[PDB]
């Protein structure tokens, strides 16, 4: 080895000894170090054995022949020391190669990465020797030609995939296809033609499905708890081994990327040095291209590994949380807010998956800094210390800022949750709000919290501006400090391109690890507390099934059993004993808080058994007090997974008297009942629950007050056909918690208790004869138009200022780098450069302008986003409130809420950041291309083909990824939606013993989410590789055209072009990523303005024909030929209600009774009618005016969240004395004075704390405080009170009354009867009879 032939001569030939030693030791050596390690994978991972195919044999036979040929050399040598050891070593490694394909066949691997890279390395080594041997010119040469031809054919064979031993093609994908991710390209094509749906999505890998990952974590956590508990131990014990490879991949990727600046150094030396061989530059550019491609492949395999591991972590955590929820104790379940348990899978699971892809940064960010610093130390020297100072002045600050960001993020979710719930209260109750005309206040109420939001979003915007400044300017800031110090401390400190641009490249390579390090640390610390929460959920006590002896088929046996609701709380059921025989009806009897429901909970192993013995025999069907309804159809609610039996189902439905409920419901039993679908009354929910229990056909039934909400006739019918001895459950052991005596004599056994203690149980007649506790009990009683629209929403001046500042930034950066190229071209004079202070001053001024302009650019667009979010929320609120209630009933509340939630969040927190990042990446790519073109114009021919290659990759990915990012977001909500359902009905899940079914359903939901998430991450890793190679071949091309024209280009220009080509690599990938994110997030801005053009209500205030202050002078109502639609519900209505005359409206279901009120409040428009109050037409008056001058007490009053005073008057227009007087007149003074908060009592959503009677009296208080002459009543215990109050002082005012009860309407004169919209009778009740 001497530079005489390997470097100096224009023919770069390797020496003969080098050829025969190192070029042969490289490949043989590769297989020797990998062979042992490869058994680990081959053994731990198995897939069967591949059959005997021609390909496998062809490879094995060539491996035998290759070994022979290599040993044939040893034979001829036997017939120089290197002529013995080298052929034998090659033969032995060849014998290891053929044995390896053999064992790979045995272990079922179709595509072999080792048997592809090994042949590639051998081929390259053979190629080098081949060229040398063909340039030298029989004896030993022909053996090498045979070896090379066989190696080439072996390499070609190794590319094809062997036979296998809508599934994901990844399993059958070749290594060439598993490194380029070519197997997803089909979806990239398919997503371009046919929009994707869930069926097209590939099935999850068997090692990736929840059915496999979750039991691993469950088993490992069980082992860890049995050992002692730390969730981190299990987390890095189960997912650690697969996550290990990401480390090797990240280390190799770091080394490969650092190799780039070294090759740039060598290329700058070559260009700067004439009289050098021309092949040296070509070798350097080929090496740079190879290094860039290898770095791309290794890096993207690393992320694939990280992203798969994070997804597995999320799946396992979600499954473990779901399975632990069904075993958790009541005490513990209540300790953690239900919403908190949903958050465990909503955020904690997500945060883990998001963080996993970057855990390796904690070890590689410092490495990419330390190695870069060493590299910088090789170029500049001690001056690099100044650069370190900049890091000490940057990385900490960002970290602090990063933490603050998270804080503000939390505060954001403080206000977001503060509004969405309020928005729900607005969305559930639009009828009452429109009638009470508080639309404008709530608008401001809602608007107030948005302003509070922006108070927090603007703080986050200041932080985000600091973050983009500290990210994009980080490479320059370090470069400026280090260059200034380097050129100032020493006068002989020459600055050549080699010692500047290479360093500059390093600064681009220290941009990423430097600023992601803080973020990641932040994402670690936050994840840390999330982890603790998970541990808190996974260390909670379990409910031992042995507590209740569940013997398969004296039916229920309890002796000396005391139960608790908690370990430390006192017993709720003290010393209970009773024996319920098979097929007997037992009624639990007691007062409120006695312990009746606790008995049924104890029989289900829900109570904590401190002592005793319970021996419930056979399956148990639980009808809980609080009915649990699944969001599935009513048929599947009753079925509860069990097979459908038409005769049994049709015997169960009417026996529960569910036939009228089926009739009223739109789709019958196929209607979507539950919270999300159609809402059901409490009695209907109890029926469904009872019907589900009856269909389940258990032997033991625990009916915790099934007849609480059903009416007396319906309850008696139900007991007759279901629970009674002559019903459906005649032979079933039925336990019924009741407080109604009507069915007590039919009960076989009455268990009457007091204070959680058995108190003289027995049969009804015997208990009555005994005259004890039971007697006492009885005696008790996308086009661009949307981008233009968002640009308008931001503000045209702000947007154009942001564009101007961005252009200034990129021009400044490009000009500063060109200035550096000129500065490095200053000829050394006597060991210095004449222009050092001037050049450095220009560089510093340009960069200071660049930094301040970056700060301005980020801040400007951030403020524009704030403004756009403000205006968009104002527009959405105004349009929603202006829309009539027909729109409100038509559109599901889900999409109306989605307009305000999870979509405003994208507009206000994602779109500004994503647009900043997109614009930055796009103009960085444009600037790099411009610099390369300026340096080497001949590279222009490169632009079309690669551009074409870009275009398709730009066209295919963005079309497909969007769908993948929608479908995923489609399946994420049900996973939590199921879990919530599971959490609400845990007792019902355990009582029916259907834990496995719900566990499998949750696993299916999670797999549905992952079947869209996995294609998304693989799409990212496919797009990444595609764009990288394009940015990689331009690095090779820029370098190649620099080498071609080295006689005219200075070293500085070459280094500048190569460095910009190095960074355009990551810039192109980030460009398209953010381009797809633009469409996905700008669809939200499009959907925000989905109601701006819909039909709105009549103007609230006309102000041209406004009525006088006392508009209802007497309250003379006149329906003059009224006709209301939504063919005509109201028709031919010509009636006159005199001022201060009580009038009621009677009619059956389907008449226009209620629709008549809708006529008074102009909620809908008159198809044909001229309703006039006094001497003024209603249709001419603005809505608010009439809605303010007329009052309505609806069917169900809505108590909005807030204080009682804001309920009675949000406009706070009426004085406190008026509020007090109205509340006293509403029979509410005693109660309203009782709250500690006086008038400021904080009532929850819908007034859950208040009783129904109270809420009704609060609505009456609202109507009374209004003090209007026209009042409407909608009638459905407190009826006596509300009727008396409406008859007390409102006699002066004209009252219309729509009551489903004739008793109250009889009191009111002038009754109007509506048969089918027509006026059937118009006169006083005296004339009625
Ligand atoms: C670190 C990051 C990768 C890319 C980053 C980036 C890239 C270019 C950029 O501006 S650019 O002008 O250089 O295009 C800004 C940023 C800001 C932060 C942004 C991400 C936050 C989380 C993440 O994975
Ligand atoms: N220089 C980076 C290149 C990798 C990269 O893609 N960086 C960012 C984006 S600029 C990232 O992690 N993206 C992951 C993704 O594509 O989701 C490194 O060393 O990791």
UniProtKB/Swiss-Prot annotation:
Pfam families tied to this protein: ABC_membrane (PF00664), ABC_tran (PF00005), TMD0_ABC (PF24357)
EC number, as in UniProt: 7.6.2.2, 7.6.2.3
Cytoplasmic topological segments: 40-59, 99-110, 303-358, 404-465, 530-791, 871-913, 957-1027, 1072-1329
Enzyme class label: translocase
UniProt-listed SUPFAM superfamilies: ABC transporter transmembrane region, P-loop containing nucleoside triphosphate hydrolases
Binding site for ATP 1: 590-597
Membrane-spanning ranges: 19-39, 60-79, 80-98, 111-131, 142-162, 235-255, 282-302, 359-379, 383-403, 466-486, 509-529, 792-812, 850-870, 914-934, 936-956, 1028-1048, 1051-1071
Membrane topology reported for the UniProt record: Multi-pass membrane protein
Residues annotated as domain ABC transporter: 556-780, 1117-1329
NCBIfam families with a match to the protein in the record: MRP_assoc_pro (TIGR00957)
Role according to the record: Mediates export of organic anions and drugs from the cytoplasm. Mediates ATP-dependent transport of glutathione and glutathione conjugates, leukotriene C4, estradiol-17-beta-o-glucuronide, methotrexate, antiviral drugs and other xenobiotics. Confers resistance to anticancer drugs by decreasing accumulation of drug in cells, and by mediating ATP- and GSH-dependent drug export. Hydrolyzes ATP with low efficiency. Catalyzes the export of sphingosine 1-phosphate from mast cells independently of their degranulation.
Record protein name field: Multidrug resistance-associated protein 1
Gene: ABCC1
